[PDB]
Structure 1
Amino acid sequence: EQQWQAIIAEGLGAQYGDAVPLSLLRDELAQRLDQERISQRFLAGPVNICTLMPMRSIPFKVVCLLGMNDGVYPRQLAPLGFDLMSQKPKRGDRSRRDDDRYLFLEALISAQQKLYISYIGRSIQDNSERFPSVLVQELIDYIGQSHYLPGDEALNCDESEARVKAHLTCLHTRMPFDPQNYQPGERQSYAREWLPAASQAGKA
């Protein structure tokens, strides 16, 4: 009732005189019913799950990023085509691509202690290589060109960059019951439910 009376009040505020069809009001109510968002439990104390929202940078100790593959991030919103702001850009103009790049910059700066970045690299259907985003690729390129491992102190520039980018990249297994995750070392899984499944010590 609130959305219907709000739609009719916004229509009659312009004093619309002609007839209005039913399907237009149905599509408008279907669009207005799904427009609502919830952000009440953003900082309640449990760990925060939210999308990247622009002009909101809060310092945190651990900042994790998901879905940083190509195509998904940065979120591209195409212009209308007949908009004049896209033709002659000014200083104060805002675009969603630049907002997402500044959001990635604010997520890099706002991270205090630990930064986690995970993207889908291999397809689950046909095992096809899924490339990451351009921002993460520039980040790992700057990491490989700005830092080197103490094992190979003076070997090469591109080879040390590839060795750093391979040491940082943890290619995890396709299935959770794989014994590679439960091998002791740097990374070890905390899922004790798949430990007898990975140990292969069960009756058939």
Structure 2
Amino acid sequence: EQQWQAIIAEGLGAQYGDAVPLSLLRDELAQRLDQERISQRFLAGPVNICTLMPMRSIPFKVVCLLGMNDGVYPRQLAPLGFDLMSQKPKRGDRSRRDDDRYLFLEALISAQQKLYISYIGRSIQDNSERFPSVLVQELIDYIGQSHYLPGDEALNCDESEARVKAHLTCLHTRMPFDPQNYQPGERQSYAREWLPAASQAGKA
């Protein structure tokens, strides 16, 4: 009723003479209903899952980014193209590309304790390989090029850099019941539920 009202009111305001067909209205409602976002629990009953929003950079001990994939993260949309402002740019101008790349920075900057980054490494069908968001590439590329693991102190730029990348990237298993998640160490699962399966402890 609100959206529907506001829509019509806005027309009446501009004093629209002609008659209007339902589609015109139904479509506007649809759109309006698709841009309305519900985020009323944004900070009570904890662990907030949401999208990266512009102009909402808050400090958190933990910050994790998921599906930061090429083609998925810096989010896109080309200006209308008959947008004069977009071809002759100026310092104030905004664009999703910039907003979005700047949000990935604000993330890095606001995490106070741990930054968690995740992406999908390959579709589970054609088993072809995926790729991370260039923004994530840049982040591990600059880490690698400025750190070295205690062991490797005398080996090589390129050599030490790879190891640091390989050390922070953690390939995960296709199924949650693969044994590797139940060995000891880096993220053994807290999910006993799959233990039996993992240990082939079943009865045919």
Shift of 1:181: 0.9
Shift of 1:14: 1.0
> d(CA) in 2 for partners of 1:59 and 1:7?
37
CA displacement, residues 105-131 of structure 1 (integer Å, 9 cap, x when unaligned) = 110010111111010012211211101
Shift of 1:192: 0.6
CA displacement, residues 132-162 of structure 1 (integer Å, 9 cap, x when unaligned) = 0111001111011000011111111111111
Shift of 1:182: 0.5
> d(CA) in 2 for partners of 1:47 and 1:61?
11
SS at 2:181 equivalent: coil
CA displacement, residues 81-122 of structure 1 (integer Å, 9 cap, x when unaligned) = 000111111111011111111101110010111111010012
- Which deviates more from structure 2 when the two are superposed, residues 68-77 or residues 25-34? 25-34
SS at 1:117 equivalent: strand
Shift of 1:16: 1.2
Shift of 1:34: 2.9
- Which deviates more from structure 2 when the two are superposed, residues 27-36 or residues 44-53? 27-36
Normalized per residue, the structure richer in helix is 2
Partner of 1:135: 135
Shift of 1:29: 2.1
- Which deviates more from structure 2 when the two are superposed, residues 21-30 or residues 159-168? 21-30
SS at 1:34 equivalent: helix
In structure 2, do the counterparts of structure 1 residues 9 and 120 end up closer, same or farther at CA, with 3 Å as the change threshold?
Answer: same
SS at 2:57 equivalent: coil
> d(CA) in 1 for partners of 2:16 and 2:187?
65
CA displacement, residues 26-57 of structure 1 (integer Å, 9 cap, x when unaligned) = 21222223332112111104111111001111
> d(CA) in 2 for partners of 1:95 and 1:65?
21
Shift of 1:18: 1.7
Length, aligned pairs only: 204
Across the aligned residues of Structure 1 and Structure 2, the Cα RMSD in angstroms comes to 1.2
Unaligned runs of 5+ in 1: none
Shift of 1:24: 1.2
> d(CA) in 1 for partners of 2:194 and 2:150?
36
Partner of 1:198: 198
TM-score by length of 2: 0.96
> d(CA) in 1 for partners of 2:143 and 2:129?
22
CA displacement, residues 151-182 of structure 1 (integer Å, 9 cap, x when unaligned) = 11111111111111101111010011100110
TM-score by length of 1: 0.96
Partner of 2:189: 189
SS at 1:203 equivalent: coil
Unaligned runs of 5+ in 2: none
- Where does structure 1 differ by over 6 angstroms across 4 or more consecutive aligned residues? none
- Which deviates more from structure 2 when the two are superposed, residues 8-17 or residues 188-197? 8-17
> d(CA) in 2 for partners of 1:75 and 1:124?
23
